[PDB]
Design an enzyme around this catalytic site. Structure first.
Site, mmCIF file in Angstrom:
data_model
loop_
_atom_site.group_PDB
_atom_site.id
_atom_site.type_symbol
_atom_site.label_atom_id
_atom_site.label_comp_id
_atom_site.label_asym_id
_atom_site.label_seq_id
_atom_site.Cartn_x
_atom_site.Cartn_y
_atom_site.Cartn_z
ATOM 1 C CB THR A 189 5.565 3.381 0.413
ATOM 2 O OG1 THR A 189 5.292 4.552 -0.136
ATOM 3 C CG2 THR A 189 4.939 2.304 -0.632
ATOM 4 C CB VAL A 190 3.213 -0.927 3.862
ATOM 5 C CG1 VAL A 190 3.526 -1.854 4.708
ATOM 6 C CG2 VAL A 190 2.370 0.366 4.925
ATOM 7 C CG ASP A 195 -4.089 8.835 13.537
ATOM 8 O OD1 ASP A 195 -5.290 8.999 13.130
ATOM 9 O OD2 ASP A 195 -3.209 8.474 12.563
ATOM 10 C CE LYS A 238 3.805 3.116 8.704
ATOM 11 N NZ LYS A 238 3.493 4.016 9.869
ATOM 12 C CB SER A 260 -0.934 0.012 1.345
ATOM 13 O OG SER A 260 -0.174 0.394 2.345
ATOM 14 N N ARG A 261 0.357 2.419 0.037
ATOM 15 C CA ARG A 261 1.004 3.831 0.009
ATOM 16 C C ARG A 261 0.639 4.629 1.150
#
Ligand SMILES: CC(C)(C)S(=O)(=O)c1cc2c(Nc3ccc4scnc4c3)ncnc2cc1OCCO
Ligand SMILES: CC(C)(C)S(=O)(=O)c1cc2c(Nc3ccc4scnc4c3)ncnc2cc1OCCO
EC number: 2.7.11.1
Lengths: 277, 284
Positions: free
Chosen positions: B25-26, B133, B41, B22-23
């Site tokens: 960025t993983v 978060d 990450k 994913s972004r």
């Protein structure tokens, strides 16, 4: 540069403290009053104090997926102990030898345990400096809630700079000790047999082993229906070789096991575990 | 007197089969020496931020916190190496209804219990760590669907953005008091609980996010009715009480994670152990 400190747990924060077993000391279960989790505690002398702190330091530094997670240290005048995660499914010894409680231990789960033991030991050996366990037994391969491995007992462990002897290489009566122990564990996992069953005296085992004799490999101990039997026998026999130089590294052992583990679909591990419940 | 463990430095060249997930960025990879699957990450100010997160993850190690394996700190590359979570996020589990037609109650309650255990630990550290978060997106799921709390980018030691549905109304106009608040995570938790039990998107009927902000500041919350929360939900009354106290307009009226845990413990004891195993096999 990034340093994590091991927490100090006041003894009074451990509620419902109950006896479990006794041995590198006494194991007791409890619950942390503030964290609301179940824990295990391994607990006067000054030399014995340094030993408990040494073990705690090793567990804290050796943190990894297949190493028993340390939660904190109990360091009071009145009490000294190591607080770890509670392992609800006991040891590998109990899983293999309690055949009434566990009639069936499916091959996918046996292979996964063997893979995770090797992953755990490989990590220790890859540390700077390398950590050598030097006391691997089925008794200190602990099993979490989903039967994933956690290596425990770092009392005899050494930075590369008693009880049972069945896992001890003959030259011990070295970076090639843990592999020997692993070869015996593999034999034991695949057979569900106690190594050297017909032996009355442990001295008779030490004599046999020094003469190059090993737990038996035949149709009775290792049936022909064992998945990847030939490959596993090769791993076992190289791992417990009389000459330490002929024993493989954990890397080689892992490269051998990776194609075996890929033959099992993920759901078969889940099904093996539910069969035990 | 202190026992200090150092976080390992992993050379980038030790990460094999590096693939985009994913972004930051993983990416997923395998460690060439450790023979395990990992997640990665990955400017001077952005460097300090990655190191700050890595330090927090290393110090906050616990059963329900994403385990950090090491750091990539090279001129050419900077990143955080963690354990790989094969079952994604809680967001994916709740909202991918085609991939997951059923998510059994025992598993939903266990996730809720483990999120609370994870946050409680952070709040009990010295000094307390406040996540600030929490989202269903950063509650990650391991191979057996156990929880691992991730994303400590906005986390704070008690001394470019996305969704606001988990943010308490008082945090909308931030400052000293907002960053200080010890009642932020419980609000987020109340919204997560609602979302876990309903499998609905909070404020689904509201198109624009600024309008959600307007509603929340007026005291409006995701709907609690028979449609969102059916009468067949185990311990419905108790869960609704927890949700409503957790997202109270007055932060002083929101419970601690301890109180929350003490309420959840009798609920979790009503589920036999095999039901958690059965819930997971049903997901495969
Ligand atoms: C090994 C057993 C199964 C016979 S036990 O009942 O003792 C048992 C031990 C557990 C354990 N031990 C432990 C604790 C601290 C340290 S520090 C280095 N090594 C250790 C080992 N840790 C966690 N859970 C345990 C669960 C046990 O049995 C309960 C289920 O039978
Ligand atoms: C969150 C997802 C599912 C959308 S993902 O595909 O990105 C994914 C992320 C994983 C992950 N993330 C991560 C890595 C490092 C840090 S440092 C602080 N927080 C994080 C978070 N960690 C581990 N495994 C992940 C697996 C993912 O995808 C699995 C398939 O859906």
């Amino acid at each position: 540069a990034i340093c994590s400190a091991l927490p100090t747990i006041p003894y009074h924060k451990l509620a419902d403290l109950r006896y479990l077993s006794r041995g590198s000391g006494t194991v007791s279960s409890a619950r942390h009053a503030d964290w609301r989790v179940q824990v295990a505690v391994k607990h006067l002398l000054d030399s014995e104090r340094k030993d408990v702190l040494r073990e705690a330091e090793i567990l804290h530094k050796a943190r990894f997926s297949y190493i028993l997670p340390i939660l904190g240290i109990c360091n009071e005048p009145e009490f000294l102990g190591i607080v770890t995660e509670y392992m609800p499914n006991g040891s590998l010894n109990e899983l293999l030898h309690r055949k009434t409680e566990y009639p069936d231990v499916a091959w996918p789960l046996r292979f996964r345990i063997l893979h995770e033991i090797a992953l755990g030991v490989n990590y220790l050996h890859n540390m700077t400096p390398p950590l050598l366990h030097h006391d691997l037994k089925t008794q200190n391969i602990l099993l979490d809630n989903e039967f994933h491995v956690k290596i425990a007992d770092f009392g005899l462990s050494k930075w590369r700079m008693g009880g049972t002897i069945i896992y001890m290489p003959p030259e011990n009566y070295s970076i090639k000790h843990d592999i020997y122990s692993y070869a015996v564990i593999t034999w034991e996992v695949l057979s569900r047999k106690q190594p050297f069953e017909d032996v009355t005296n442990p001295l008779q085992i030490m004599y046999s082993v020094s003469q190059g004799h090993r737990p038996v490999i035949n149709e009775e101990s290792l049936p022909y229906d064992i998945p990847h039997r030939a490959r596993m026998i090769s791993l076992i026999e190289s791992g417990w070789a009389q000459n330490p130089d002929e024993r493989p590294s954990f890397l080689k052992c892992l490269i051998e096991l990776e194609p075996v583990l890929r033959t099992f679909e993920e759901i078969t591990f889940l099904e093996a575990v539910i069969q035990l419940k």
